[PDB]
Design a protein around this ligand. Structure first.
Ligand SMILES: Nc1nc(=O)c2ncn([C@@H]3O[C@@H]4COP(=O)(O)O[C@H]5[C@@H](O)[C@H](n6cnc7c(N)ncnc76)O[C@@H]5COP(=O)(O)O[C@@H]3[C@@H]4O)c2[nH]1
Lengths: 331, 331
């Protein structure tokens, strides 16, 4: 049938092709699909000659339900296969398998496909264009897909935050404990907490009545991303040991991971509690691999992974105490 | 030969296997690899019985150069193939092809492999374990790999920022223009600027002497990720039209994309100027797809993609003017 179009969708399908060698093959598929009612976006007739920029191709993809990907032996050699073809390929295999319609011409060897396209289910179109009705089937089919979050979270957290606060953070923390007379009861490392469920708390004082907000480090003011005087503040807390003595520390959660928790709770999002654990562990590895490259930032902070499934109002305070032990022992 | 170990690497290889059906096959490969000098991490002997948690497996992967992935017909059915096996698979095909050593037992059909493993180059190990020396080759080989950043950037930017400021932002902007008497010369939509090169500026006033910092919106103070009183501030600028009249607007860059610029400039990072354009366009699509789901946030802001390759000190001011035109016209 002719599926009705969602609001952003103005085309039924966008024909992604290599204009050097398959601009004639793509035009043939255009007629085969539009003859049976569908409205497609063909670059030669629907774009302006000078308005074939990368963003214009992207808007057509954003405004089309499906994307017919024309792949030929000659197209895999041109720069199109390593540039504009990939802009129609999503990381989420869920969206790829529903949105992308690969069409293999001539040599249909799936092994020759780049790694992005190799695990996809493609249609073999004969040299006489007889499987053209197979293409029409994938366009008639009328839960948000989730790609991989590990690399985006880790690289952004490093360049966009850790690279900002961690340089000369030792002096800032040591100058804080000397002013407040916290020697022997406060470390100099920034503690980044990584709960297993990724459920970040508004304040570490929400874990137990033993954690108390005790101040903050000097505010880092920076004009970034067009926001003038964006504040980067680090909060100081304190835990009470079993011996009634207060140990201080600069602590915070890895707040970027809280998105994985919110996506898991959002029933419309395609991220279940099982993949959340996978995405969080790929994030843990990637971030720790990035920190190994920068030794002046890695050893100025301490990542602490733990489970937060138990309801013990004492499990979290003693964990922070046992974590400051190592830091004070190493000093 | 026996390759020397990098600092975090304490094992030559981590044997990732399904303990239900291949715990005996994995032990066989352990002896075949350790007999020739390599130090491996085998779960049955190197982990404690109760200390086989997901994070412990991850630390072993972080502390091993290579990862030998044992894959059998019976392992693809257990939950291990859909959970712990994927934690050794990186999104970056560059790191995967160098670090991951897939070992196919019994049925070696690459089509049966999940999409993460299907585009990989695997070793067929016979039922008599004769290709065991092939495994040793991939472990002897002694530029940072970059996965895909689109989904991590887009989902984080939405839940972690847009979902915070955009609700009831119309009243905040309209209350700002009514107080400063900016009717007819100021819109009510937040302008998110998306330069093609991803080079975000510290202040939009850095584009031209016509852009002036003219204040900010009321500060949004929130305890998030354990940081008490984290400020979310939106800056107000003003452009000067060709007629000398000042048009106001709330504007800012999509600062998450600046990481792609810094990774491109960092010569050690495996992200060139060509993939940066690909990753930025996958990000543009993914973010706009996310915003379509939330119609109360999408239509309260305006993404503006443009080229910033020219040095025109007038191209940017007139672009902001032509962008406020549509918003004032639609009011
Ligand atoms: N614990 C903690 N304290 C902070 O001050 C802080 N600031 C940033 N981050 C996290 O590190 C990374 C920095 O990347 P980036 O700035 O490019 O993207 C940011 C940025 O583009 C935008 N954003 C967030 N907060 C603001 C803000 N106050 N003003 C403007 N834009 C903002 O939304 C993206 C994601 O924000 P978060 O989801 O809060 O986590 C960030 C991010 O993962 C912080 N983490």
């Amino acid at each position: 049938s002719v599926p009705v179009l969602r609001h952003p969708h103005v085309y039924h399908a966008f024909i992604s092709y290599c204009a050097d060698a398959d601009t004639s093959h793509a035009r043939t598929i255009l007629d085969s699909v539009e003859s049976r009612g569908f409205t497609c976006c063909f670059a030669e007739r629907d774009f302006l000659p000078g308005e074939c920029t990368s963003d214009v191709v992207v808007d057509a993809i954003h405004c089309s339900k499906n994307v017919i990907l024309v792949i030929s032996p000659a197209s895999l050699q041109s720069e199109w296969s390593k540039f504009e073809m990939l802009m129609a390929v999503d990381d989420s295999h869920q969206r790829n398998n529903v949105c992308l319609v690969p069409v293999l011409l001539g040599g249909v060897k799936v092994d020759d496909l780049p790694p992005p396209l190799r695990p996809l289910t493609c249609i073999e179109l004969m040299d006489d264009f007889r499987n053209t009705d197979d293409i029409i089937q994938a366009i008639s089919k009328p839960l948000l897909p989730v790609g991989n979050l590990a690399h985006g979270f880790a690289w952004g957290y490093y360049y966009g935050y850790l690279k900002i606060i961690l340089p000369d953070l030792d002096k800032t923390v040591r100058q804080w404990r000397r002013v407040n007379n916290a020697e022997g009861r406060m470390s100099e490392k920034l503690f980044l907490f990584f709960p297993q469920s990724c459920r970040c708390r508004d304040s570490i004082a929400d874990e137990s009545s033993l954690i108390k907000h005790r101040g903050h480090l000097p505010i880092i003011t920076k004009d970034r991303a067009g926001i003038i005087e964006r504040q980067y503040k680090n909060t100081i807390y304190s835990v009470t040991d079993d011996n009634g003595e207060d140990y201080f520390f600069a602590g915070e959660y890895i707040g970027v991971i809280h998105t994985m928790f919110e996506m898991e709770q959002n029933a419309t999002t395609g991220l279940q509690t099982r993949e959340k654990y996978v995405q969080s562990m790929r994030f843990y590895l990637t971030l720790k691999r990035i920190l190994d490259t920068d030794p002046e930032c890695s050893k100025k902070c301490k990542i602490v992974f733990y489970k937060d499934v138990n309801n013990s109002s004492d499990a979290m305070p003693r964990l922070i105490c046992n974590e400051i032990k190592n830091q004070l022992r190493k000093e």
